[PDB]
Design an enzyme around this catalytic site. Structure first.
Site, short mmCIF file in Angstrom:
data_model
loop_
_atom_site.label_atom_id
_atom_site.label_comp_id
_atom_site.label_asym_id
_atom_site.label_seq_id
_atom_site.Cartn_x
_atom_site.Cartn_y
_atom_site.Cartn_z
N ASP A 166 2.70 9.47 9.34
CA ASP A 166 1.39 9.11 8.86
C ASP A 166 0.50 10.47 8.61
O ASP A 166 -0.14 11.15 9.48
CB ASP A 166 0.63 8.33 10.09
N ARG A 194 -1.16 1.58 -7.93
CA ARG A 194 -1.03 0.69 -6.94
C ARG A 194 -1.05 1.58 -5.91
O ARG A 194 -0.09 2.59 -5.64
CB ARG A 194 0.25 0.06 -7.07
N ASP A 196 -0.06 2.05 -2.52
CA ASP A 196 0.81 1.59 -1.31
C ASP A 196 0.17 1.70 0.05
O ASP A 196 -0.51 2.79 0.25
CB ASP A 196 2.03 2.28 -1.35
N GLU A 232 -2.89 -1.93 -2.29
CA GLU A 232 -2.25 -3.09 -1.51
C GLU A 232 -2.66 -3.37 -0.13
O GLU A 232 -2.57 -2.44 0.57
CB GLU A 232 -0.71 -2.72 -1.52
N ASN A 297 5.98 -10.28 -5.12
CA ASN A 297 6.14 -8.99 -5.31
C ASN A 297 7.43 -8.36 -4.63
O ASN A 297 8.27 -9.31 -4.35
CB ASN A 297 4.78 -8.42 -4.70
CA LIG Z 1 -2.45 6.05 7.95
CL LIG Z 2 1.84 -5.01 -4.18
#
Ligand SMILES: [Ca+2]
Ligand SMILES: [Cl-]
Ligand SMILES: OC[C@H]1O[C@H](O[C@H]2[C@H](O)[C@@H](O)[C@@H](O[C@H]3[C@H](O)[C@@H](O)[C@@H](O)O[C@@H]3CO)O[C@@H]2CO)[C@H](O)[C@@H](O)[C@@H]1O
Ligand SMILES: OC[C@H]1O[C@H](O[C@H]2[C@H](O)[C@@H](O)[C@@H](O[C@H]3[C@H](O)[C@@H](O)[C@H](O)O[C@@H]3CO)O[C@@H]2CO)[C@H](O)[C@@H](O)[C@@H]1O
Ligand SMILES: *[C@@H]1O[C@H](CO)[C@@H](O)[C@H](O)[C@H]1NC(C)=O
Ligand SMILES: *C(=O)[C@@H]1CCC(=O)N1
Length: 495
Positions: A166, A194, A196, A232, A297
């Site tokens: 992360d 997009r 993610d 998303e 998706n």
């Molecule tokens: Ca994070």
């Molecule tokens: Cl998506």
């Protein structure tokens, strides 16, 4: 919030795992003439090369660097694609994986799509470069270091999504490296992104990164054009994090859309199409102007992410075409069409054990997309965007763009219909008996070609023909045994 498509083009298509050269060709030979607004491409940045299992589709969501070097192609091929697509008025949207790098357990080495060295264990990604203090190891508070409970909004943001290292998105350095990557793409010509795993990033950190982004390339776009952003965020309720928390950054994926459309069409739990009269916010969905909608998706068509067993996919072709048709005819949200590849789906105890299988390939090399004479695709690419029923509904949406939802009809069960102003009308029969009735279409009198069963070609219809009289009414007949149990007509299918 705006897609930056050409005026009159209202949908984007996800050409999942397609190679850059194939997308460039598709833009020129199909997408441009068929009116598609754009293409969402798989992550273009270097990723971990995974052998066990063998090159799974998901290895592309484990970044190694921001070099545009993947199984889809290199940087020159990527630029070539963006240029050729933009040159024919078809946009490119990048799936930006900026929340993390690779899985923390991946072995250090050069098993990456471009040969870049990386050491997950030491938090070392020199190709960017990122090091130990660019990750959230010290920030995360869970005992595993991974996300363990979605009811705690903080760990969802500060800990590792299924072990993925992360990134410390609060750091200006990290924000800047990500912006450097995204601005490279923007200047190259991409129209949007997009984002993610947005649920895993603080709304404020995303905003900070977006504040560093350039306006779209002025050689193709009007001055001051902001890149289209769709985050998303899987919000089906029951969790502290809401989709609305991200409205300040751009649009957000509305996963409730396909989840409920799937249950309605499959008629689960007593649901039926007549209930769709108030489809949209009435069903608890986000504002139409912030929604990026879709039936399925890349994740939920194979049991990943969320949406449930209700999700409709190309595997359920007949019902799928109807779901996609309803979506493309209804004014709610901005539509994204899925284009997939066939994989050896194998169910064991209700689950697909081959849900990891990557795209068609020869020893790891993705296969090109071959086009057949009937316009379908070979090499196992499904090419749903090329199905007549979907392709014509993509044009339907363009034709009726801006027109109001009106002239709704329903039999109290699963036979419904509605129009879009005086430009289009669509009829559905999902009951186990025939739908034969005269309906008010809101359309100008004349003969219309049904664009589902056929096409308007050389002044004639190849399929069903509908006759609208002076009162705007027309008779519709749809047997429950019909190949496609829905009919759609519009201004441009009129003879
Ligand atoms: Ca994070
Ligand atoms: Cl998506
Ligand atoms: O110089 C040798 C060194 O290069 C690389 O270090 C980079 C760091 O990994 C990266 O985090 C970044 O460091 C910045 C901090 O993130 C930021 O908070 C602030 O302190 O400024 C730092 C310097 O700009 O950049 C450095 C340098 O590129 C490489 O990753 C290391 O392994 C290597 O030892
Ligand atoms: O424009 C090209 C063709 O598009 C359409 O073909 C689609 C089918 O509509 C779609 O259902 C799917 O075929 C499935 C078929 O309906 C189902 O009965 C069968 O058992 O499984 C198939 C799943 O692969 O795919 C084709 C395209 O490959 C249209 O129907 C056709 O006339 C057009 O030529
Ligand atoms: C439609 O088909 C008929 C019958 O072949 C043909 O005569 C006519 O020319 C066609 N329509 C147009 C506009 O070409
Ligand atoms: C919408 O997608 C983009 C990002 C927010 C904005 O103003 N334009």
């Amino acid at each position: 919030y705006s897609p930056n498509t050409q005026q009159g083009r209202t949908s984007i298509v996800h050409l999942f795992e397609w190679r850059w050269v194939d997308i460039a060709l598709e833009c020129e030979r199909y997408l441009a003439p068929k009116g598609f607004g754009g293409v969402q491409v798989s992550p273009p940045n270097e990723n971990v090369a995974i052998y066990n299992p063998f090159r799974p589709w998901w290895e592309r969501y484990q970044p190694v660097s921001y070099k545009l070097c993947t199984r889809s192609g290199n940087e020159d091929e990527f630029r070539n694609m963006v240029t050729r697509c933009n040159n024919v008025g078809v946009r490119i949207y990048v799936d930006a994986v900026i929340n993390h790098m690779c899985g923390n357990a991946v072995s250090a080495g050069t098993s990456s799509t471009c040969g870049s060295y990386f050491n997950p264990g030491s938090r070392d990604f020199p190709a960017v470069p990122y090091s130990g203090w660019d990750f959230n190891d010290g920030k995360c508070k869970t005992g595993s270091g991974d996300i363990e409970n979605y009811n705690d909004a903080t760990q969802v943001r500060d800990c590792r999504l299924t072990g993925l290292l992360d990134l410390a998105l609060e750091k200006d350095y990290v924000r800047s490296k990500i912006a450097e990557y995204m601005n490279h793409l923007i200047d190259i010509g991409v129209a949007g992104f997009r984002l993610d795993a947005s649920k895993h990033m603080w709304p404020g950190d995303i905003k900070a990164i977006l504040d560093k982004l350039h306006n779209l390339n002025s050689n193709w776009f009007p001055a001051g054009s902001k890149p289209f952003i769709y985050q998303e965020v899987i919000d089906l309720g029951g969790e502290p994090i809401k989709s609305s928390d991200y409205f300040g950054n751009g649009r957000v994926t509305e996963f409730k859309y396909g989840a409920k459309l799937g249950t309605v069409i499959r008629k689960w739990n007593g649901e039926k199409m007549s209930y769709l009269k108030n489809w949209g916010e009435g069903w608890g969905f986000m504002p139409s102007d912030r929604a990026l909608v879709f039936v399925d998706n890349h994740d939920n068509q194979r049991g990943h992410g969320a949406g449930g067993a209700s999700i409709l996919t190309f595997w359920d072709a007949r019902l799928y075409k109807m779901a996609v048709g309803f979506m493309l005819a209804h004014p709610y949200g901005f539509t994204r069409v899925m284009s997939s590849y066939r994989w050896p789906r194998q169910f064991q105890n209700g689950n697909d054990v081959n849900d990891w299988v990557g795209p068609p390939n020869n020893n790891g090399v993705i296969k090109e997309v071959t086009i057949n004479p009937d316009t379908t695709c070979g090499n196992d690419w499904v090419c749903e965007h090329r199905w007549r029923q979907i392709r014509n509904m993509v044009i339907f949406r363009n034709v009726v763009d801006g027109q109001p939802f009106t002239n709704w009809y329903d039999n109290g069960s699963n036979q419904v219909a509605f129009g879009r102003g005086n430009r289009g009308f669509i009829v559905f029969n999902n009951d186990d008996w025939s739908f034969s009735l005269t309906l008010q279409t809101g359309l100008p009198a004349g003969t219309y070609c049904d664009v589902i069963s056929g096409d308007k070609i050389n002044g004639n219809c190849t399929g069903i023909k509908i006759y609208v009289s002076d009162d705007g009414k027309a008779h519709f007949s749809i047997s429950n045994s019909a190949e496609d149990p829905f009919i759609a007509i519009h201004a441009e299918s009129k003879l």
